[PDB]
Design a protein around this ligand. Sequence first.
Ligand SMILES: Nc1ncnc2c1ncn2[C@@H]1O[C@H](COP(=O)(O)OP(=O)(O)NP(=O)(O)O)[C@@H](O)[C@H]1O
Ligand SMILES: [Zn+2]
Length: 294
Amino acid sequence: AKEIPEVLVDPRSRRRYVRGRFLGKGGFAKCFEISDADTKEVFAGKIVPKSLLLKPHQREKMSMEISIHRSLAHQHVVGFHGFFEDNDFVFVVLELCRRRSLLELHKRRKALTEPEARYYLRQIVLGCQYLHRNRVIHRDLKLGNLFLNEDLEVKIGDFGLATKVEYDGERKKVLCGTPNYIAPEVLSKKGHSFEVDVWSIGCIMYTLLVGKPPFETSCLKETYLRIKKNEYSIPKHINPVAASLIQKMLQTDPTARPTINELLNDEFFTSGYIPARLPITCLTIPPRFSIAPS
Ligand SMILES: Nc1ncnc2c1ncn2[C@@H]1O[C@H](COP(=O)(O)OP(=O)(O)NP(=O)(O)O)[C@@H](O)[C@H]1O
Ligand SMILES: [Zn+2]
């Protein structure tokens, strides 16, 4: 393995990025804080070694991911600030999300308060609404792909399984990769579109409110069996408005699911308290949303 430069240089822009603290790893990419040596502005740098891009198919996926991600601009989508390469690495410059993802929140907090779930799910639906309006299916919406900035605002990231719908009614027959919250129409290879993202948000809603994923077993294939059969149950302590929206979203028939555009008009959002912001304490301590201090 070749060792990553301590300074990243974009020859076309002229900008220079000092490699700061290591943020984490996934598939091909190591992620670091990187600072523009001029402006001192700090970004997430995703660094992919070309030594793992030897096959054209893997190169085509990376270039498709960049093509999709670079064209997106929205408050609840990870900002794409640029990309460049040398002989050994592809460098992608992203909006730094300093508070990790909803996966690290989930591991610490398990089941969230209903208003927290409402707050996060609104932002996820808003981001995904932007994607679907722009004919992008994410196809891997999960807690680990839902990044949190310093103000605990949701940023949808990782367009590694994302695809452009090219014409009305196009059904994708190929999903090269394994999504976490995989839709039944993908498992049964019956062809799929935008509705797989609504299924995924259904699973995310269930996990945030319940404190565990809806179809979890010890075997991934036993899990796929349960998804096929629609074999989940909502605990009885879940409020029936929440329970009802989960049920609408987690239907086997993708035509029966609400579209991304129907979701925010649901009773779960309109008839419930949505906080305008969450304090940092919500990373570790359940909020009470008290009317005043004591
Ligand atoms: N904008 C960002 N801000 C902060 N950390 C980030 C950011 N983008 C990526 N990371 C971190 O780097 C990891 C890998 O990047 P990611 O975009 O998730 O691609 P991946 O390699 O496909 N991983 P995965 O999401 O697990 O499938 C993430 O899980 C985070 O730990
Ligand atoms: Zn493939």
